Amino acid sequence: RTYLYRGRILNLALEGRYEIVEHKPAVAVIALREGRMLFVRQMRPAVGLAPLEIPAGLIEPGEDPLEAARRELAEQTGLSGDLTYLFSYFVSPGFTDEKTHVFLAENLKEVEIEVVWMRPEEALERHQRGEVEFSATGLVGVLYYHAFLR
Amino acid sequence: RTYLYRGRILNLALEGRYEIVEHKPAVAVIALREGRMLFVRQMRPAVGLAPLEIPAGLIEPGEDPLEAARRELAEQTGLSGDLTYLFSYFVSPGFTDEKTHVFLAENLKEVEIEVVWMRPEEALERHQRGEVEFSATGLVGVLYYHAFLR
Numbered sequence: 369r370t371y372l373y374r375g376r377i378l379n380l381a382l383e384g385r386y387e388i389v390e391h392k393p394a395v396a397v398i399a400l401r402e403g404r405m406l407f408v409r410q411m412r413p414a415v416g417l418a419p420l421e422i423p424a425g426l427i428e429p430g431e432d433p434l435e436a437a438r439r440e441l442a443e444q445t446g447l448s449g450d451l452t453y454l455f456s457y458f459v460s461p462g463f464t465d466e467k468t469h470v471f472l473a474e475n476l477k478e479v480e481i482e483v484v485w486m487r488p489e490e491a492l493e494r495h496q497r498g499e500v501e502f503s504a505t506g507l508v509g510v511l512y513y514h515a516f517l518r
Numbered sequence: 519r520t521y522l523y524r525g526r527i528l529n530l531a532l533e534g535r536y537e538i539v540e541h542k543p544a545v546a547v548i549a550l551r552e553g554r555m556l557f558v559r560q561m562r563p564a565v566g567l568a569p570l571e572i573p574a575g576l577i578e579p580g581e582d583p584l585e586a587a588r589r590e591l592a593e594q595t596g597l598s599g600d601l602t603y604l605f606s607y608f609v610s611p612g613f614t615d616e617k618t619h620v621f622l623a624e625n626l627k628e629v630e631i632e633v634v635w636m637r638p639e640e641a642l643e644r645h646q647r648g649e650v651e652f653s654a655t656g657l658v659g660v661l662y663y664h665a666f667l668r
């Protein structure tokens with residue numbers, strides 16, 4: 369386990385033959401209101417475009433997933449709500465340890481990055497038409513909706 | 519766009535203030551048979567455990583997504599089938615450009631990593647119980663099933 373780089377949000381290490389990127393864990397929030405899902409878009413230099421995502425971010429020191437979810441929702445959309453933990457996933461276990469904890473937000477209230485309210489059916493349609501790209505969080509939100517929120 | 523490391527499956531670069539990991543694109547295959555989804559597990563040093571995933575891998579030079587999907591399915595499970603492109607997603611656009619193309623496989627045939635046939639409902643239950651972890655591909659497969667394959 370030798371380190372080649374220690375950065376701000378990631379470290380690059382070598383474990384034998386494997387190249388490993390250590391990354392802080394993240395959270396993502398699925399929120400539905402009047403049939404529209406709360407998506408967000410922002411310039412992502414890593415990909416050179418703005419994919420359709422849902423409110424998400426890195427867990428700060430001292431924070432547990434639930435608290436980070438509350439914070440990211442408020443900072444990105446100015447909203448607050450009743451949060452329920454759904455599930456988690458490793459974004460790409462073949463090279464990084466980034467783990468994402470997904471929550472559902474209900475009873476949204478305005479308490480205070482482009483906010484994109486859109487019907488999940490439309491988001492999926494646009495993507496199929498090649499008009500927009502998805503981040504893992506955006507796709508998970510869309511599929512979760514079709515599976516359990518209709 | 520300065521490079522700090524050029525590796526086998528990834529390059530570490532710096533674009534101004536952003537740390538960027540360039541990664542080859544990938545494919546993932548969702549396959550259902552008799553109510554069971556085709557999951558796979560393998561030791562993943564990046565996370566120190568074996569999460570529940572679906573057949574997936576990197577696209578090789580000269581390959582398009584469909585061909586890579588065919589290959590990964592055959593090499594990991596010894597199966598072949600009729601493949602249909604579903605959608606794609608960026609695993610974590612905040613730092614890497616890894617993009618995953620997801621396909622559906624039908625009419626599986628044996629033509630020739632642990633193969634784990636499991637009902638998606640059971641996979642979800644086990645995860646909720648904290649008995650197993652999910653990779654993004656595994657979760658996407660589970661949600662896709664609940665949304666469109668029941």
Ligand SMILES: [Zn+2]
Binds near residue numbers: 425426440
């Ligand atoms: Zn943040």
Ligand SMILES: [Zn+2]
Binds near residue numbers: 428
């Ligand atoms: Zn921070």
Ligand SMILES: [Zn+2]
Binds near residue numbers: 575576590
């Ligand atoms: Zn491979």
Ligand SMILES: [Zn+2]
Binds near residue numbers: 576578
């Ligand atoms: Zn290869």
